[PDB]
Amino acid sequence: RAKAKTRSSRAGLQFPVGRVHRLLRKGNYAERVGAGAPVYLAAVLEYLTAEILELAGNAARDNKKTRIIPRHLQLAVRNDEELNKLLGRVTIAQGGVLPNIQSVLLPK
Amino acid sequence: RAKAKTRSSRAGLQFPVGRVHRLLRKGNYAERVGAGAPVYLAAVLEYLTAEILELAGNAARDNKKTRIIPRHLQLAVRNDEELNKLLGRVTIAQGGVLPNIQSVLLPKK
Amino acid sequence: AKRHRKVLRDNIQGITKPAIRRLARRGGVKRISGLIYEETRGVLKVFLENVIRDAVTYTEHAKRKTVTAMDVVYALKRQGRTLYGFGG
Amino acid sequence: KVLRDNIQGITKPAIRRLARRGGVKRISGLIYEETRGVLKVFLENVIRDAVTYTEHAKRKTVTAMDVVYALKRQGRTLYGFGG
Amino acid sequence: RKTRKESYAIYVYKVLKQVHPDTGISSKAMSIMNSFVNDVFERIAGEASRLAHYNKRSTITSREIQTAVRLLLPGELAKHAVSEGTKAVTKYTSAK
Amino acid sequence: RKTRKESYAIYVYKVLKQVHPDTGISSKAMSIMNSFVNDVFERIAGEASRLAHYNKRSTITSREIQTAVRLLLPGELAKHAVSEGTKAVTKYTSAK
Amino acid sequence: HRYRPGTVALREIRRYQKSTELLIRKLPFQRLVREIAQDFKTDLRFQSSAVMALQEASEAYLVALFEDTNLAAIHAKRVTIMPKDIQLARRIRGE
Amino acid sequence: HRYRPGTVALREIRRYQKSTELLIRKLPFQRLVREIAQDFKTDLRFQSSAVMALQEASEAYLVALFEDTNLAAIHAKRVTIMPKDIQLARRIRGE
Amino acid sequence: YVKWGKLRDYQVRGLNWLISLYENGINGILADEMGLGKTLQTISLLGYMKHYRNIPGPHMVLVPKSTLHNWMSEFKRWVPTLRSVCLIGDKEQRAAFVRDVLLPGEWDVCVTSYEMLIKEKSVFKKFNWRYLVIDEAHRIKNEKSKLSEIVREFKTTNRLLLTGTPLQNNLHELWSLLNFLLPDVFNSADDFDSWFERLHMVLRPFLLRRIKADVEKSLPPKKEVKIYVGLSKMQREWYTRILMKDIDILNSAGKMDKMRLLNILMQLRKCCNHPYLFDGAEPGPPYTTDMHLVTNSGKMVVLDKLLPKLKEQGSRVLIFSQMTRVLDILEDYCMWRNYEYCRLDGQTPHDERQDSINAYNEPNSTKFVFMLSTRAGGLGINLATADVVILYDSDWNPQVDLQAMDRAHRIGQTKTVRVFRFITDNTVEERIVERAEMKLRLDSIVIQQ
DNA sequence: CTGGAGAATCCCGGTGCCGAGGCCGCTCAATTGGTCGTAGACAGCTCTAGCACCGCTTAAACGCACGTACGCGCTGTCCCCCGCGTTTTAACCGCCAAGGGGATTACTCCCTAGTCTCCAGGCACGTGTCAGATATATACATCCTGT
DNA sequence: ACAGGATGTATATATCTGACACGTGCCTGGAGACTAGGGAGTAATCCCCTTGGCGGTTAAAACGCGGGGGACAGCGCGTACGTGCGTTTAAGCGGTGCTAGAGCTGTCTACGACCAATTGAGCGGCCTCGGCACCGGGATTCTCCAG
Ligand SMILES: Nc1ncnc2c1ncn2[C@@H]1O[C@H](COP(=O)(O)OP(=O)(O)O)[C@@H](O)[C@H]1O
Ligand code: BEF
Ligand SMILES: [Mg+2]
């Protein structure tokens, strides 16, 4: 037997291709599932993950703090139009409201 | 072998137990389906069918028609507080609008 | 010129003012401002864009050149706009 | 044993801080009675389903997952509680 | 032609005549009625499937369909639908 | 005795380091990222399942996932994502 | 003879609410569906029933939006609907 | 000294729109949740995080409703929220 | 009984054959070649059924709209003892005529269009009719058409078809006429199939045909000329871009967008006729230049042959087209030339149509060109005055064209009629002309009895 | 208009701490290889229903003008919140106990899927006929005007 | 205040038409009746996490009430609303022609699921020096008011 190479290494990905395949097979999505399907889905889940954490990291540095916390994630999603369209029906715990007053209410 | 009896006849129902079982088995809901699951589901679909047609037939009768049409069905669903909650997000074709004019809008007296 | 007697409007204009007024009358509106015809056309066009884009995604996936009634019904269902009467 | 009316335990100061996070500058007095009923109707809908799930599982304890599934049905996804 | 098309139409008509012997129904109305049965079927089977998964079970049973009916229907319909389902399963089991 | 619980946390951590090398993350922000990955997995897999039933096929494939992604994601996110996934399948099929 | 302002407006409201017909013309609407589509993919054909599903869904959407617009007008103590009332209805609905 | 009517209301908006704490007091809400549960089943016990999941969801719902309610009062040319503004927002939402 | 003039020997023999059908109790088809007087043969039959059989009972005639004023005129001329009445007009006029003229029952022949029958079907089914004459019977060739259904519900002792193109495209479209005449004989098209070298066996009992070449040796035969033409450079450009489907063209900016092409065949056909039919194609939004029009169309370059004709005695001409816009551009060309002309089309009102025909036919008339749309103007109207016919377009049905040519070649034509057909050489217009000729072969213009 | 006073967060530098990253061990799901059988790509055929044009008729929309319902800017009005301080109650924190019941593993044995075979419910089909349509007529509603 | 005009509306009766309604013939999913082997249920065990005990004592809620903000009614003013006229427009209907491409069946062979076997990524457990909560020092700088 030759030495093993995990399918994520073959596709050049950090998320797990093997686990995604099990989850699909046992999740009642279809009678069968192809071998390119877990590779495509693992690549999309890692891209969307990197898209959030990039803007979260920048919100953490803007607050001058080294660790991402749950508020930083809210400030990222809400301040981007497409992530706010993707996550428009979601509540995030320990997430504040973006700062905002209607200009009618401000003093003269 | 003995002469066939439909499972709907055994349950005392008009809807099809056999078709419902096949639909569930081939819809990828669970890897197994029980024997009572198709009978319970056929009973519920026939009950909900009868609830709509009773109200629709009354609406046809009040309108002096012998035939139920898509307008009678809308009137039935929208005047019942539970069916209008069950069906709050569906559009019925050729279904009109219940008549309502707000009070402010009406002539003065 | 006989050749130029006819002039064509944009296809949005086909939704006429008489056509919008009846829809507002079915909705129970008594009096209508003159700026609403421009506003209503903009709103319908955004609705048709979002339904059609999906109905065409389904058609392409099936490798067909014809949009069917089922392609429209599945697109409306996926957006919370369930429609009865056209099958499914 | 049986709890009396705790809906008066949602205080006037606490309802006012929720109106402030929502950007509200001035509040009429009758908002508080109105808000308590609105909250009670929302909680009744979420708890009813959360308990239907617990009963199906044959458990006496309501879990954080039972609440998360109840909210997910009503179009209110919540991140953070094991979802 | 050369291809059949299943529908609930005959079942909807057999129930119609028990509820109102005198009335008939149009083809447009019968097409809406077929759509209602298909929509309700897909709702109840989606909740049942999820319930099984959450509880780590391989089978959908009548106990999962009873709970799906209780999660989906408004209160007066739910209490009657559960009564009609339990009457049918008792009668079916007596003949089985 | 005490059973294991799976999560995405070690992959989320390895992707952060690639994006912002010096930054860390709290355990609550990890619970939220683990919730996000599972929500998006379930959305894509549910649309990919239906599209196959509509067209009467029994197999989920990369083409049904590609259509599912175009239906679910907003416009620009969809474009970049589609490129990332088609890139990954191109690299994988060169090395299977 | 001349009926007063708004006397005929109530008479039309009652007629149209009773009827169940489509109010937009079919050719002028069919020509708009086709143009919007050409942007997404080119040279498509359409089933005759598919354009009717689009027209039923469109007229149902606009009638329902005109109800929310009229309650937002009466809240501001007016009887005339205006472009701002359409915009508040679409904002509170989250679209 | 005395600040003027509405000046401290703005500081309170800014302060609560920066923080992510829960605003309702915890123990009182725990008694409210349990009281509601007795209508459905007797002698339920509860995980501690199940009550925090209910509180997070409940405060998120009320804050969002107060935003839709405020738009309605500004639409009617006022700055004070009224019971009819909550009723309009819920009605237009479809609740 | 017939007053104004004498029937010719073949008209006499045709009358005796129609009488023999009546006495044998059969219906039948009269299908002499166009221009041979089928209308007078019909008017004389009705005179007989009154003067000799004592039947003044109601009779009906169905016609195309453009011939309602001719039929009426001939009734008034040859046989003034018949009491003919005509239904036409707006809803109020039809209601007034029904109420004040029809229902009184003071008439013996009723003349109507096919649209007037489809409108007043519930009135006309009250009466019991003695004869039902349809003219241009090819109109009922498709049995599923609403006129064909409506026409079989009438109470009629006798039925009659008049048509000079009894064959159109297939044997089922002729069976559909036999099934109106004798539905109890030709019970089915599956029975007509198989019955069918079976030439004239089925036909002779119920059909009669004579040809001008046999029965009118004095009428000059037709001359037919194909003129093959090249495309202009602009037409060659558009014809290639249309095939590629990169027409582009958008008047509202959008970098020209794309024009849709779900049917390319019709776009290619348009182009051959003129480039200006397309949007944004005419150079210069001001327009009004006219030399540019003649040059950018290979057909129009050749059409200046009209100047030779006008100088070459009064070779007055008819121009036929299948597209309404082409008559527009030809009309702007004639107006810019300062020519004298007439135009008939499907948009024209009824009163105007007959005035135009009359003005063009007068013995001292000065109009050189008549423009006719091929559907409305190609049937029934008689225009013996003109010597020349131009077919700018070519139709998928050969028989449509034949009729149009015969608007001039008819009894009373003193001179040889020239027919010119334009064909763009290396285009789909070749395939259309080849297809139409493939359809002529199976008809063969059978002379018959 | 605007100087001044004086309560608001706001930086700054020290102090302690249990959160987060590291590693250990070792657990149990991914890996490879081989094999089986059937999903789905291909090509071919047929023939339904897509499109265009023109013709026909007349509902419909177009623009015009008329005149008055009601859009919305100021003013006066006087009630009900706001903000302050005070006193007051019940939240938080921490500490420590009993025992409900989540959870584990283990055992046993009822349940459903599989296969093949079989024959009757349900499919489309074609046809007579009666709810429905609408034509004309009128009788009773409701609205407007002017006096 | 309320008399006749006028208008639309309702419904009475007549005849009429075309979607429904029956039954026919036909054929393919439902139903019989056994074997298969796993899921499921129920016993019992362990010890996580829940339920109130007390006291302590901060902070939060509560009360009362001076005072000026905004809510709200009314008036007058003025310009797009609606109304109906005549007019022109093209929806709607029907009809012709044609062939794009949905649909079916047929055939053949790449693919995935499965098994057994294998060994490494990933799990939980036990660890600790460094992120950053917290306290108490001074910094402007928010806002407001009587000169
Ligand atoms: N016997 C005749 N004597 C004189 N003129 C005749 C005679 N028969 C026909 N015509 C004229 O010849 C013309 C062509 O006849 P027409 O009725 O149009 O035949 P069709 O309808 O078959 O073309 C008519 O205008 C008619 O006036
Ligand atoms: F046969 Be014809 F020219 F009416
Ligand atoms: Mg003639």
Author numbering:
A (entry chain C): 11 to 118
B (entry chain G): 11 to 119
C (entry chain B): 15 to 102
D (entry chain F): 20 to 102
E (entry chain H), F (entry chain D): 27 to 122
G (entry chain A), H (entry chain E): 39 to 133
I (entry chain W): 174 to 369, 382 to 634
Quoted passage from the original study:
Here, to address this issue, we develop graphene-oxide-coated EM grids functionalized with either single-stranded DNA (ssDNA) or thiol-poly(acrylic acid-co-styrene) (TAASTY) co-polymer. These grids protect complexes between the chromatin remodeler SNF2h and nucleosomes from the AWI and facilitate collection of high-quality micrographs of intact SNF2h-nucleosome complexes in the absence of crosslinking. We chose to use SNF2h as a test case because SNF2h adopts both monomeric and dimeric states on a nucleosome, with the dimeric state being more active. We generated complexes by mixing 500 nM SNF2h and 100 nM nucleosomes with a 60-base pair DNA overhang on one end in the presence of 60 mM KCl and 2 mM ADP-BeFx and directly applied 3 µL to ssDNA GO and/or TAASTY GO grids. Using this method, we obtain high-quality single-particle cryo-EM datasets and determine high-resolution structures of the SNF2h-nucleosome complex.
We therefore refined all the single-bound particles together, resulting in a ~ 2.5 Å global resolution map of SNF2h bound to a nucleosome at SHL-2. Inspection of the DNA base pairs confirmed that a majority of the single-bound particles correspond to SNF2h at SHL-2. In contrast to our previously determined structure of the SNF2h-nucleosome complex where we only observed density for ADP, we see clear density of intact ADP-BeFx in the current single-bound structure. In addition to intrinsic nucleosome motions such as nucleosome squeezing/expansion and DNA unwrapping similar to motions that have been previously observed, we also see SNF2h rocking on the nucleosome at high resolution with the single-bound SNF2h-nucleosome particles. In agreement with this hypothesis, closer inspection of the nucleotide state for each endpoint structure from this variability component shows that SNF2h bound to SHL6 has clear density for ADP-BeFx, whereas SNF2h dissociated from SHL6 does not, and only ADP is clearly visible. Therefore, SNF2h contacts with SHL6 play an important role in facilitating ATP hydrolysis, which is consistent with previous observations where mutating the SHL6 interaction interface in the homolog Snf2 also resulted in decreased ATP hydrolysis activity.
